[PDB]
Amino acid sequence: XXXXXXXXXXXXXXXXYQVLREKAASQRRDVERALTRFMAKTGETQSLFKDD
Amino acid sequence: KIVAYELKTGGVLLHPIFGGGKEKDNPASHLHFSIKHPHTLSWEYYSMFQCKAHLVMRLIENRISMEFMLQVFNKLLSLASTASSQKFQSHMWSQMLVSTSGFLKSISNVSGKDIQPLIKQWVDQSGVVKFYGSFAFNRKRNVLELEIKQDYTSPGTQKYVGPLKVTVQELDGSFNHTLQIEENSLKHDIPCHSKSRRNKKKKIPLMNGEEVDMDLSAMDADSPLLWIRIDPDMSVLRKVEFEQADFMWQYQLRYERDVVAQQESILALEKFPTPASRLALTDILEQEQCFYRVRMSACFCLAKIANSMVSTWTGPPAMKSLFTRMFCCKSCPNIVKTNNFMSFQSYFLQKTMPVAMALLRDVHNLCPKEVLTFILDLIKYNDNRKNKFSDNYYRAEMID
């Protein structure tokens, strides 16, 4: 079969349930902290310590 | 609110009485004037005024039929709406001032009972009554039979209320109710239960309807009693102090037909104990259809008692198993995440529980590290618009 016949490649299952929703929720946390850092250094800023 | 405020402060009194003629007659001048005036009082005072207003109308339920209350109020509003909406009957019009005296008169016209004692107790002696109804145990194979003493004295803010009655649950039997007296150095009996013996055979001789329960777990050699109560319908303004066997408290938490009883055994077992059976019965209470806020204070019971589990860490890191065994989204492989609403038992319960989990501390550095990281993970796994319910307060109490 290694020369004559052929096959088909789908190649991406990735269906690991808890791992999937870990990916999604971790990404949501990322976008949270990203926009936080952005408007953090963007707008009027007051701190918790001095100069953070 | 009422007990806390009138033990902070003096009474909240409902005068008919003046200090007319530049007279005071104000023991309740612990801060300020009240008699003729709105604008002396505190919002603490005015709030508790309304609260005593609720509960004294409950006492008027306690002496008089609700149907008669409908009768009274219909007569009130009949006379008022009659006296309204006319050509101003001259000199004959102020029937819409329907104040205390003639109202009382109309009550007694509907049913004249001894409610002027009710007045001079509660309307006209602004005092909260604690209760040292001291549990004794006769028919502990005792010659004397099912007896408990009545006791009270605690000044600063005290009051002595005598003739009332007492509500007791037997094993599987009668709601025993027993009179009270003044001159309160008293000893009293119970309308005795049967010889509840061979109770392996007497499994359920009709506890309360078709309720189903079996434990010989209590001190059941000679305990034909289950629960003490004075006035479960909460007649007298009360703060009741007594002691039972802890078995009886926990078994009341196995079931009772009063939220009153359930949260007060919640408080009584928040004080002292730590068996793991306490933890067990607590969790058992948390997992049924019983009540919402019962379970919230039950969470705080677990908080106190697992804080008493420092050297006695016998149970697990608590309540993680409760999020395990009560919460399956898609069987929840080790973490509960998504869309857990529309069942508002679970709404309040998920809203409450991780706070009491964040209380769980044992003295090394009080070390709730697993709980810490777990709660951070809870904050991770929040829902999209699949929840139609604005995932808001859940965030708020995870933050708290």
Swiss-Prot record, chain A:
Signal peptide: none annotated. It is found in: Nucleus; Cytoplasm. Induction: Induced with triglyceride accumulation. Component of the TFIID basal transcription factor complex, composed of TATA-box-binding protein TBP, and a number of TBP-associated factors (TAFs), including TAF1, TAF2, TAF3, TAF4, TAF5, TAF6, TAF7, TAF8, TAF9, TAF10, TAF11, TAF12 and TAF13. Interacts with TBP, TAF1, TAF6, TAF10, TAF11 and TAF13. Component also of a small TAF complex (SMAT) containing TAF8, TAF10 and SUPT7L. Forms a heterodimer with TAF10. Interaction with TAF10 is mediated mainly via its histone fold domain while interaction with SUPT7L is via its C-terminal region. It is linked to Neurodevelopmental disorder with severe motor impairment, absent language, cerebral hypomyelination, and brain atrophy: An autosomal recessive disorder with onset soon after birth or in early infancy. Affected individuals do not show developmental progress, are unable to sit or walk, do not acquire speech, have poor visual fixation, and show poor overall growth associated with feeding problems. Additional variable features include seizures, spasticity, and joint contractures. Brain imaging shows hypomyelination, thin corpus callosum, and cerebral and cerebellar atrophy. The TFIID basal transcription factor complex plays a major role in the initiation of RNA polymerase II (Pol II)-dependent transcription. TFIID recognizes and binds promoters with or without a TATA box via its subunit TBP, a TATA-box-binding protein, and promotes assembly of the pre-initiation complex (PIC). The TFIID complex consists of TBP and TBP-associated factors (TAFs), including TAF1, TAF2, TAF3, TAF4, TAF5, TAF6, TAF7, TAF8, TAF9, TAF10, TAF11, TAF12 and TAF13. The TFIID complex structure can be divided into 3 modules TFIID-A, TFIID-B, and TFIID-C. Belongs to the TAF8 family. Ectopic expression of the histone fold domain acts as a dominant-negative mutant resulting in differentiation inhibition. 'Taube nuss' means 'empty nut' in German. This is Transcription initiation factor TFIID subunit 8. It comes from Homo sapiens (Human).
From Swiss-Prot, chain B:
Expressed in all tissues tested. It is linked to Neurodevelopmental disorder with feeding difficulties, thin corpus callosum, and foot deformity: An autosomal recessive disorder characterized by impaired intellectual development, microcephaly, delayed psychomotor development, pyramidal signs, thin corpus callosum, and foot deformity. This is Transcription initiation factor TFIID subunit 2. It is found in: Nucleus. PubMed:9418870 was unable to show an association between TAF2 and TFIID. The TFIID basal transcription factor complex plays a major role in the initiation of RNA polymerase II (Pol II)-dependent transcription. TFIID recognizes and binds promoters with or without a TATA box via its subunit TBP, a TATA-box-binding protein, and promotes assembly of the pre-initiation complex (PIC). The TFIID complex consists of TBP and TBP-associated factors (TAFs), including TAF1, TAF2, TAF3, TAF4, TAF5, TAF6, TAF7, TAF8, TAF9, TAF10, TAF11, TAF12 and TAF13. TAF2 forms a promoter DNA binding subcomplex of TFIID, together with TAF7 and TAF1. Component of the TFIID basal transcription factor complex, composed of TATA-box-binding protein TBP, and a number of TBP-associated factors (TAFs), including TAF1, TAF2, TAF3, TAF4, TAF5, TAF6, TAF7, TAF8, TAF9, TAF10, TAF11, TAF12 and TAF13. Interacts with TAF2C1. Component of the TFTC-HAT complex. The lineage of its organism: Eukaryota, Metazoa, Chordata, Craniata, Vertebrata. Belongs to the TAF2 family.
